[PDB]
Amino acid sequence: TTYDYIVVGGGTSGLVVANRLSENPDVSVLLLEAGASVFNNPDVTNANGYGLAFGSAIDWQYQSINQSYAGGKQQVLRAGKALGGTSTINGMAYTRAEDVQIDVWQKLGNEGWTWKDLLPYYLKSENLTAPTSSQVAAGAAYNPAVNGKEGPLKVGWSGSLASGNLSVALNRTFQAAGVPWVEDVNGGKMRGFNIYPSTLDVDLNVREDAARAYYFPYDDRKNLHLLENTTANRLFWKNGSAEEAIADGVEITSADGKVTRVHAKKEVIISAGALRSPLILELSGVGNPTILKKNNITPRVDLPTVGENLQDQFNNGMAGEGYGVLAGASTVTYPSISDVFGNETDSIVASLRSQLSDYAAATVKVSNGHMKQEDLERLYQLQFDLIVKDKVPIAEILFHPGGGNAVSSEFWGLLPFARGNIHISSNDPTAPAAINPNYFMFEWDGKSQAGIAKYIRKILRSAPLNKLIAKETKPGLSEIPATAADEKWVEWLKANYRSNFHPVGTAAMMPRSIGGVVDNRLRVYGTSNVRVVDASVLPFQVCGHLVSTLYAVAERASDLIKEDA
Numbered sequence: 001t002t003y004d005y006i007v008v009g010g011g012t013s014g015l016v017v018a019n020r021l022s023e024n025p026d027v028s029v030l031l032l033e034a035g036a037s038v039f040n041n042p043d044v045t046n047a048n049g050y051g052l053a054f055g056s057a058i059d060w061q062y063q064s065i066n067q068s069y070a071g072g073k074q075q076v077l078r079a080g081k082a083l084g085g086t087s088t089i090n091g092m093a094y095t096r097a098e099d100v101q102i103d104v105w106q107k108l109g110n111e112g113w114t115w116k117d118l119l120p121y122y123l124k125s126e127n128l129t130a131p132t133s134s135q136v137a138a139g140a141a142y143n144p145a146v147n148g149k150e151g152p153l154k155v156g157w158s159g160s161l162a163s164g165n166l167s168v169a170l171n172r173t174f175q176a177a178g179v180p181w182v183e184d185v186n187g188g189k190m191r192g193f194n195i196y197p198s199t200l201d202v203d204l205n206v207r208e209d210a211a212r213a214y215y216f217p218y219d220d221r222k223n224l225h226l227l228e229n230t231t232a233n234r235l236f237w238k239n240g241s242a243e244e245a246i247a248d249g250v251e252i253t254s255a256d257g258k259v260t261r262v263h264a265k266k267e268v269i270i271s272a273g274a275l276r277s278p279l280i281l282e283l284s285g286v287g288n289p290t291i292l293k294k295n296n297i298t299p300r301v302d303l304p305t306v307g308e309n310l311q312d313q314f315n316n317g318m319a320g321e322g323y324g325v326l327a328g329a330s331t332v333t334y335p336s337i338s339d340v341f342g343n344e345t346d347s348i349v350a351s352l353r354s355q356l357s358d359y360a361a362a363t364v365k366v367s368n369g370h371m372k373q374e375d376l377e378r379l380y381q382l383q384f385d386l387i388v389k390d391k392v393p394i395a396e397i398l399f400h401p402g403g404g405n406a407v408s409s410e411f412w413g414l415l416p417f418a419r420g421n422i423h424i425s426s427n428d429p430t431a432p433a434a435i436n437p438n439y440f441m442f443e444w445d446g447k448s449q450a451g452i453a454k455y456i457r458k459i460l461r462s463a464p465l466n467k468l469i470a471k472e473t474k475p476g477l478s479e480i481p482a483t484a485a486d487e488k489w490v491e492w493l494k495a496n497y498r499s500n501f502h503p504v505g506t507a508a509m510m511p512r513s514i515g516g517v518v519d520n521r522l523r524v525y526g527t528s529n530v531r532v533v534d535a536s537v538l539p540f541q542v543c544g545h546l547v548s549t550l551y552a553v554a555e556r557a558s559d560l561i562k563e564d565a
């Protein structure tokens, strides 16, 4: 039961690592996956099936604690339980990050993590199919210099894509609001309006999940091994004389309930997702001693920010009704703070600036003092500067034809300041975690969401879109009158929001001295040979949809692992 590498979690990120490490025929790799293949699951393969698998056997359906700042209700936190992980149930959108927000990773002390360093790995991951003439006419575009042609992840546009009145009107309406069309949001500058591509195999007309990309075309490799329906509980350690912890292997529970062990000669890579990887660490004795001791776990490594620094987004939705049939492309708009707030920007900025130290003080308490005031002030300053000085997008706004006369919009603030945490509730590896994203904790988080909603209301009634749109239907003017105060908007947003399912930061890549959990090679502090490679390591949220960046991070991590070997 001994392998060179064990990769825990055959998901979006884990499959990349397993693929790349097994390129060396003399290296054995074991993948552990709690779920199973969805190669033949038609609700996964369905190119238009986003949403169908929600609440099914392939959705973990994690649940938050009461969201005390958001009206008190608990929230489902969805995630894929499948070979391919969350890439099997997600919305398939392929968008990246702002260059300067990846550059911040190196600024805060993560050597080698910048846009210029990550770009080659975005390229390495990707195989973009160029749009057809009909797709071009609909608005599909790309910058060849920033798209890969040979990577495992197929990317492209739907065969159903055709030009229509709605997407043309949106282009014009956003341009009139000062937000122009851009050919590609994936070259490090995201601001603009765009007919975005998807993780789609256009040759087959199926969802391109991580397993179809990185696993199945390679499953004849004799040095790559997969255990499906197999849950990793925790790591166990070599018993020696030195302080530094050396992982010996992983304890697993199989479908028949048998608990056994597998061993790693080189390293254990944890890729179980942002809502599981930190828990695996805690159960292994890597985490906050107070939490471990409450659960009768002896610390192997005192690393009290494991599970801290959880950052997620929340989304809301609006809708309109056309005079007639609405048709065309699905579109994304990434507006900056000044795009959303216009002439009130300076006042919004002044208010936010006056709040940063107070946000930090509140977050210190969330972490029971394990993130320091000074450190959080500096982290929040970096985010503030991205918003205010670099003018990174503060919102994602999707517009979709909804069939017939319907148009829907789905939107979210990209960079809320709220931080929460996730922690084990017991030493029992089956026990649900206490998950607390702290949605709506800070004024900016709700105020920006309300600003975005108000902006969308304005767009729906602006020229030339207002020639197509008869009225707003959600919330509509009955539910939220034209003269309603911001509190009415915030109350409505709180009553109707969903998690955006973009949790990051629970094993954050930062210097240990500022509260990081992993180093710049993704190695867990205090260990020799344990890495986390998944959304847990992102130290801040990004502007785009996560898989593109997670694939790139895992591609780069794979090279770092090989170099260390």
Ligand SMILES: Cc1cc2nc3c(=O)[nH]c(=O)nc-3n(C[C@H](O)[C@H](O)[C@H](O)COP(=O)(O)OP(=O)(O)OC[C@H]3O[C@@H](n4cnc5c(N)ncnc54)[C@H](O)[C@@H]3O)c2cc1C
Binding pocket: 008, 009, 010, 011, 012, 013, 014, 032, 033, 034, 035, 078, 079, 080, 081, 082, 083, 084, 085, 086, 087, 089, 090, 091, 092, 093, 094, 095, 230, 231, 232, 233, 271, 272, 273, 274, 276, 280, 500, 501, 502, 503, 533, 534, 535, 536, 545, 546, 547, 548, 550
């Ligand atoms: C509904 C939804 C829609 C989304 N929309 C988009 C979108 O349109 N575009 C986009 O880019 N991103 C989207 N996202 C986000 C993106 O899909 C995820 O952030 C990303 O897939 C997470 O990758 P990961 O490697 O961190 O974890 P995952 O892909 O979740 O992988 C973790 C893997 O570990 C397994 N696992 C967990 N615990 C254990 C255990 N103890 N033992 C063994 N295995 C375990 C899981 O079953 C899973 O396969 C969406 C997410 C959701 C939930």
